[PDB]
Design a binder for these strands. Structure first.
Length: 211
RNA sequence: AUUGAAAGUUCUGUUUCGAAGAAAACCCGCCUCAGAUU
């Protein structure tokens, strides 16, 4: 199981509108991160024949694990929800085993935006390595699933609804999955939360929790 | 190529016309550059 870290500098912020008044999300979903990763290889094509229906040029990277977190302060504003965090930093962690280190690093250096067109984002540095799996009590900053238990004080937890990869095909709605975010609503920032969990990869001290 | 792909809240308008900081008032009343030298 290999892992990679990437540091992104944002220009003005990101904007992803909730499916189904147009409120937005607080942090990008894993689908957006996987698509941003896949952009490095599938650049220039917008419709590929999956075999039965044209749904997206991204239904092939669906088995890559990804998380992300903030490192600065920003504000969520509706005026079409947006998250303004100019000149901020975003740290993204990719954990997978499908491709070798070289391919993942090459695709990691090839990220241009997160969400819509305006949300450009530069790349400052990357790291590649091998991760280890543990199950003891850990402290994390990246968001995780709803089913994961919690030992600390419930003070900085929020609930959001994300979708699986099934939504990659047009004319179809993805399955709803609950997620827990360790975020302060105003102003936006990230806080550490201690969890027990069952699977957690050590990617440099900042343990990442998946289940 | 990411609930992503496609979208100008844009066009038109004077803060304008008029109204003396003006009239009265001494700086002024006394004081040696003076005694000695071819």
């Amino acid at each position: 199981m290999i892992y990679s870290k990437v540091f992104l500098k944002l220009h003005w912020g990101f904007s992803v509108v909730k499916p189904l008044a147009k409120p937005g999300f607080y942090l990008p979903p894993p689908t957006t991160l996987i698509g941003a990763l896949s952009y490095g290889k599938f650049r220039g094509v917008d419709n590929i024949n999956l075999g039965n229906v044209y749904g997206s040029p991204a239904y092939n990277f669906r088995n890559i694990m990804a998380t992300a977190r903030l490192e600065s302060e920003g504000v969520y504003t509706e005026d079409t929800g947006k998250v303004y965090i100019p000149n901020g930093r975003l740290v993204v962690v990719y954990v997978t085993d499908s491709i070798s280190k070289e391919e993942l690093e090459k695709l990691c250096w090839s990220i241009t935006r997160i969400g819509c067109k305006e949300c450009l984002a530069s790349v400052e540095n990357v790291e590649v390595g091998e991760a280890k799996k543990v199950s003891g009590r850990v402290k994390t900053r990246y968001y995780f699933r709803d089913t994961v238990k919690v030992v600390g004080r419930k003070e900085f937890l929020e609930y959001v609804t994300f979708w699986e990869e099934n939504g990659y095909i047009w004319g179809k709605e993805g399955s709803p999955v609950r997620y827990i975010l360790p975020i302060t609503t105003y102003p936006l920032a990230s806080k550490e939360v201690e969890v027990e969990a069952k699977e957690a990869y050590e990617v440099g001290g900042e343990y990442v929790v998946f289940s």
